[PDB]
Amino acid sequence: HMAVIDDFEKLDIRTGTIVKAEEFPEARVPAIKLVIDFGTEIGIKQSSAQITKRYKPEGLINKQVIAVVNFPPRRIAGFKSEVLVLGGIPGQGDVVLLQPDQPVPNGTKIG
Amino acid sequence: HMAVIDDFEKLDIRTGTIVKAEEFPEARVPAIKLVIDFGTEIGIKQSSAQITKRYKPEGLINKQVIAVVNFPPRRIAGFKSEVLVLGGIPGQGDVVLLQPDQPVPNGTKIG
Numbered sequence A, B: 001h002m003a004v005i006d007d008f009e010k011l012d013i014r015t016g017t018i019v020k021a022e023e024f025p026e027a028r029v030p031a032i033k034l035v036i037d038f039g040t041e042i043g044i045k046q047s048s049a050q051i052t053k054r055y056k057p058e059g060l061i062n063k064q065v066i067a068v069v070n071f072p073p074r075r076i077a078g079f080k081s082e083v084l085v086l087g088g089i090p091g092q093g094d095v096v097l098l099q100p101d102q103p104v105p106n107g108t109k110i111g
Helices: A005-009 B005-009
Strands: A013-023 A032-037 A044-049 A064-068 A074-076 A079-081 A087-089 A096-100 B013-023 B032-037 B044-049 B064-068 B074-076 B079-081 B096-100
Touching: A032 A064, A044 A079, A064 A096, B032 B064, B044 B079, B064 B096
Parallel strands: none
Antiparallel strands: A013 A032, A013 A064, A032 A044, A074 A079, A087 A096, A096 B096, B013 B032, B013 B064, B032 B044, B074 B079
């Protein structure tokens, strides 16, 4: 139950901008396919995000989001999800996205 | 270097509301003491945050923040800092706080 700072330092947590978002009707659990620009050191990354409760694709473009970018990928229905986009989880199937409280460059590190 | 999801699962990342904010510097760097309500289970925690570049105490009260709650405490700026408040780091001495993009209850878990 207790972590150390070393646990946290293993993670590469970064800001990126949603540049594409589409409904993902092939996922078992409702999801949106995201493409996110993490700047040129990290690259442009795909994510499958179970965020259909509060969000629509037309509302996601140009949002700054927060993701762990140094995990192995997960394939769902053939789509390669490359990053874990972080959010608060107020209840089952519910997500509230995290964001920097003001704009920062893509690839800005979190600590 | 790469991480695995359970490096992430070791962390307990929670939302909380800043209920008090005071200037509490170190000798060599300014800093703010945050008193944060993480809801009824976690309770009230304190944090030393080097966030004075963009923020004043008056602009911090009532803000929902994101923090790692299950680290060992550390002594800093004359008190026990119990929680790591997360922000983007755009440059030397600069911090942009993370927030939920919409209000969530205190103690909402991040995933």
